Write a protein that binds this DNA or RNA. Structure first.
Ligand code: ZN
Ligand code: ZN
Ligand code: ZN
Ligand code: ZN
Lengths: 73, 72
DNA sequence: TGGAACCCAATGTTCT
DNA sequence: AAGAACATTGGGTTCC
């Protein structure tokens, strides 16, 4: 299938969730770092393969929403 | 000293409009090179100092309609 | 599967 | 004013 956050081609199941590799490192980066991002829209940006980069705020919300956590295993 | 695009550090009329330096470069790059910018919202994103990075579609649109143009 | 370390794309600066 | 040229940040891929 495709990633459950961004719809790119998934690379397997990471931090609990079928994601592609990019969202994997992105989530890892967001959780261990700061993630104080601001949405420039209405906190419901569409996170597809190109737009992934537009809004880290919504991208991270979606990661959370889909269930990602560092302690999956 | 308020940029007509990202309402930031306004530094004189670039490409026909009072703009910051970062919006200066962005515009020439947007028109010159080819990328594809698509809005992830509603084609009305908030383009301010922190958030201008988030949506180049909307930033680019705000540029064009604030009068911006090269070979001015 | 999880993470390191490359590598790269875009932005924003300074300097001319 | 315009633009060459850095520097940097954030992102995404590669691990004969
Ligand atoms: Zn993804
Ligand atoms: Zn958003
Ligand atoms: Zn500006
Ligand atoms: Zn937008």
């Amino acid at each position: 299938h495709m990633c459950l956050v961004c719809s790119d081609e998934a690379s397997g199941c990471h931090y609990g969730v079928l994601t592609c590799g990019s969202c994997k490192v992105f989530f890892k980066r967001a959780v261990e770092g700061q993630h104080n991002y601001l949405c420039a829209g209405r906190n419901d940006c569409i996170i597809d393969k190109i737009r992934r980069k537009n809004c880290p705020a919504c991208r991270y919300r979606k990661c959370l929403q889909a269930g990602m956590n560092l302690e999956a295993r």
